[PDB]
Amino acid sequence: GLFDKLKSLVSDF
């Protein structure tokens, strides 16, 4: 859900 959004941004930059 949301907590998954922060995990995606950390994987990019």
Side-chain angles (χ1 to χ4, degrees):
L2 200 86
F3 202 83
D4 283 66
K5 230 291 293 94
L6 85 85
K7 272 180 154 171
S8 307
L9 197 86
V10 173
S11 164
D12 291 354
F13 116 86

